[model samples]
Target chain A: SKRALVILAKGAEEMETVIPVDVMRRAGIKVTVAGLAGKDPVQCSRDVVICPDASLEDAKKEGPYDVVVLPGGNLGAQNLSESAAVKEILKEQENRKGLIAAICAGPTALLAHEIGFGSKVTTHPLAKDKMMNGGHYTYSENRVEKDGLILTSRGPGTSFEFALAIVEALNGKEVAAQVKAPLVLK
Target chain B: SKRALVILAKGAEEMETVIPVDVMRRAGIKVTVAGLAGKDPVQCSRDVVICPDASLEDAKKEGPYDVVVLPGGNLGAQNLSESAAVKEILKEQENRKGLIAAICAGPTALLAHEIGFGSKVTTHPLAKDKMMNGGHYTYSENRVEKDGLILTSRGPGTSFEFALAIVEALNGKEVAAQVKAPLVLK
Candidate 1:
């Protein structure tokens, strides 16, 4: 089964990360919560703790996932970018032909690795200038955006759209459509 | 000020319940988590222990909220429906004309109360057959389904859609649309 790696950090926006992972799982994708070492109880910006599926070190040990997802928050994205382990994973995904997705301030992690350079991407409105500093950026009314195998979205508000894009990308449009039909999104 | 009630119980899907609460707060919606008495430290199906925001008793003290959201999980839904306190609140929602939204098996609680008898609704595929016994059922893969003031969704995968739908219902489509825009759903 193909697995999607979801990077988590203290203060990560819960919706930006969990929604897509949950949606992907519903679409029959295996999603893993990979958190930093010593950050076992991952907390949201609002103080909610989320248990991770595996620690970052363990995730790296497992290695070679099909996709890497980054859920962003005010300081969480910065913390993830500052993590050498997360950086290593991003580089590995780029090297292994795996997909990379960053939502909200999530693009900061992608920007940290220099992967988004010359690539199309999107992020939180306030963070757009910061994002453009590192990559070829495009603003969208789209809840989710994809460039090559890289997927991105604006923020917590776009979490569902972000998840839908991930499902469509990994499981095909039909699955996404099936999920979308009930929402009247078709 | 509108307070959003979140039901938490053992086997409650953590991401599905918590992420939306987190998003609602970020979007400036006052949200509270209430647990059935004697069920301390609500556990997620994935084995995560989530601290309850308040007890059902306290929920009443804080009550008269604008909306009550029931999060989905098979075991949790069963437990919630069995609680006298929860059923009392559900009845109150009807009296107050407050919105009631359920996701995944959470909607089963509504069906248990016969609230769906005349309303069109949807739920996770696994429980659809049972839900149809009382409601005008519509099978959908939709992230969220709205039948008048009652909102429902399939499962953990649709949490984002469900949350976004509630935001739209409570705050109006414009605010929901504004929130969705940054996420690129615009």
Candidate 2:
């Protein structure tokens, strides 16, 4: 079975964090919701509190996952961008040609960590300026964009597409379709 | 400001619960996520854990809210159906002509509690049989169904629409549109 790592942070968009986690699990992926600040429940942007399965410090020891996911909220992305642990994890994933996926302001952390330069990406419309500050990656308005091992998506609304794309990459097109059918996506 | 009370339960669908909570808060509604049991972390159907703001016992004391929301998972809806407290809350909400919303398998709880008997409704396709068992209500396959104060929706895919409909009911269409724009909904 494919394994996924989703790094959760305080102020993360709970919609972005939960949607992908639930959908990916529905696809039979083993997903780890790892907290950046330790194993305690983290408060989200809208004040939703989600308890993480493991802390980042502990989750990294279980390394080399199929995909590393980053969910977005402005402050959450800032927290990810500043984490030495996140920087190391993302860098290692990049060096090994593993998938690194991000959504909304999440892609900004990739730029901060210098992880996916030159990859075609998309972010929440509001996050574009920060993500493009150095012209490190080309931006697309498409809801979900993938260039090689780097997958990026827009905001809360585009989460289903982003998750299904990950399912397709790891599980295959047939599995992604099967998983998507029941979601009743229009 | 409009206020919403989302009843959270063990085994509830985390996506259905969090999306509506997050989106309603975005639209400037005061949203309360109340645990069906005591005030502890509730384990959702997908195993995602969410900590509620208050227990339902405590939350009901603070109502008659603008709307009362019910999120769905088969087991969660079963729990809701079996609860005397849930029955009392929904009945009171209905008697006051306040809005009562449910999604996915959630509307089945309405059938069990005998709330919104003649209102047009919708549910996750798989849940239609259970919701329509007694033919108590008219059913619609529309992604989001609203007949008077009884609002209902399909599954995880239509959560955004369902939540926006609540926003429209309380804060008006202008507010819902403002909230939807940044969500990047297709």
Candidate 3:
């Protein structure tokens, strides 16, 4: 089974985090939601509290994951962008040609770590300016955009598509379709 | 501001629970995620751990809420269905003509509690048999269905529509539109 590492930080969007984690697990991927801070509960931007499976320090030791998922919220992205551990993970994933998935403001972290430069990306409109600041990458208005190993998506509303795209990438189109059927996606 | 009480049970769908709570908060609704078990983190069906705002016992004391939301997972709905406290709350909400929203398998709890019979509803397609077993309430294929004070929706794929519908109900279309804009809903 493919393994996915989802980083959870304080002020992360709970919808983005939970949707992808749950959907990926449904796709038969082994998903570990790792807390960036510690093992304690992380309060989301909307005040929902999520207790991650393990801390980032503990989870990275279990790497190199098939994909590293970054969920989005401005402050959460900022924290992820500033994390040396995250930079190392992204760098290693890029080195291994593993997929790197991000949503909303999450793609900003890729820019911060200089991970997916010159690739096409999409972000929450509010984060576009920041993501495009240095012209490191091109942007798309699509809800979910995939350019090679880098997968980017828009805000909370596009979480399902983002998650299914990851499933398709890791598990294949048949599995993605099978997993999506029960979800009642329109 | 309108207030919502979202009952969170062990084995609940975390995506269903968090999506509405987060989106409603975005619509300026004061949302309280009340754990059915206790104040401790509730383990969702997908194994996500959510630390709810309070226990159901504590939350009821603070209600008469504008709306009471029930998120779905088969086991979670069963837990809600079997709870006498839940029965009491649903009954009271019904008496007050307050909005009662349920999604996926959640509407089964309303059947169990004998609330909102003869109303049109929708549930995760897999849950339709159980929800319509006694044929008390009519069913719809719509992603989100609202009949009088009861609002129902399909599976995780339809959660965004379900949540936005609740926001529109409480805060009006203008506020719902404003909240929907940043979400980048398709």
Candidate 4:
């Protein structure tokens, strides 16, 4: 079985965070939703509250995971981008050649930490400027784009595709297909 | 602006509950997430914990809402079906001809309450047999099916379509579209 770490920050898109966590679990991944702030419930972008499994401080000890997921809301991504802890995690994941997946403004954190420079990535359309600022990475208009170990996707609408892509990377196409079928995806 | 009542129970699909609540709020709808069990956080089907705005006992006092939404997970639906308070709420919503929306197994509660007989409905494919048991309502495979005051949809994968359909019904297509565009939905 694969293991995944999903970082939760204040003001993160609840939909993006929940969708991936739910879908990845469906694909048989051992998922840990870690609160970046603390073990307390995080208030999402639209004020939905989520109680994470653990704080990042504790979750990191269980890591060296198959994948690390970042969900995006503007302020949430900004918080992630500014976190020294997040920087260390992303760098270590990149160093280990493990998958690092992010969606919407989440890719901005990749740029902030310089984790996936020169990789093909995507972000919510409104976040394109921030992600492409230094011309260090190539941007794709695809809803979910994958280039090597770094995977990126667009906004809330693309969360399913983004999660499925992560499942495909770790669990293979057959598992992804079996999981997708029950989801009633179009 | 419209108002919505979302009933949350233990084992509810957190994605289904949060997506609609979050998106409906984005469309400027006043959404109250009501805990069926109590005011404490409800543990979802995937083990996600959500803190509802109020208990159903409290939320009812504020209702006579434009829509009452039922999110689905088999246990959650069964709990909804078994609730005497849910029966009264569904009865009142039907008498008032307000929209009563259910997704996945959620439509089973409508059947339990005898709320929307003769209306076309849909549920998760696995739930089709249970939903069609009495032949009280017709079933459709449409991602989001609306038959007069009853709105139904399939599983988690169809939640976005289900939520947007509700937004369009209450807030108009233009508002729904504006909200949809930002979500980057296909």
* lDDT tens digits, residue span A16-128, model 2: 99999998999999999999999999999999999999999999999889999999999999999999999999999999999999999999999999988989999999999
TM-score of A-chain in each prediction?
0.91, 0.99, 0.99, 0.99
CA lDDT of each prediction against the hidden true structure? 0.76, 0.96, 0.96, 0.95
Candidate 1 chain B: worst 10 consecutive residues by lDDT? B177-186
Best by DockQ: 2
Model 3 TM-score relative to the real fold: 0.99
- Candidate 2 colliding pairs: none
* TM-scores for the candidates: 0.78, 0.99, 0.99, 0.99
lDDT tens per residue, model 1, B1-186: 567988887877676787678756756788888877643666676555566777878887888888888887888888877777788888888777788989888888887765645666778777787777734555555567787778888876566678888887778778776766554434
Distance from true location, Cα of A61 in model 3, Å: 0.7
Question: In what order do the candidates fall by lDDT, top score first?
Answer: 2, 3, 4, 1
Q: Which lDDT value does model 4 have at A88?
A: 99
**Model 1 vs. true fold: TM:** 0.78
Compose the digit string of candidate 3's lDDT tens values, residues B1-186.
999999999999989999999999999999999999889999999999999999999999999999999999999999999999999999999999999999999999999999999999999998999999889999999999999899999988889899999999999999999999999888
Task: Compare candidates 2 and 4 on DockQ and give the better one.
Answer: 2
Q: At residue A112, give the lDDT of candidate 3.
A: 96
Each prediction's number of clashing residue pairs: 5, 0, 0, 0
Candidate with better lDDT, 3 vs 4? 3
List each model's interface RMSD. 4.1, 0.5, 0.6, 0.7
Tens-place lDDT digits, model 4, residues B87-186 = 9998999999899999999999998989899999999999999999989999899999999999999999899999999999999999999999999988
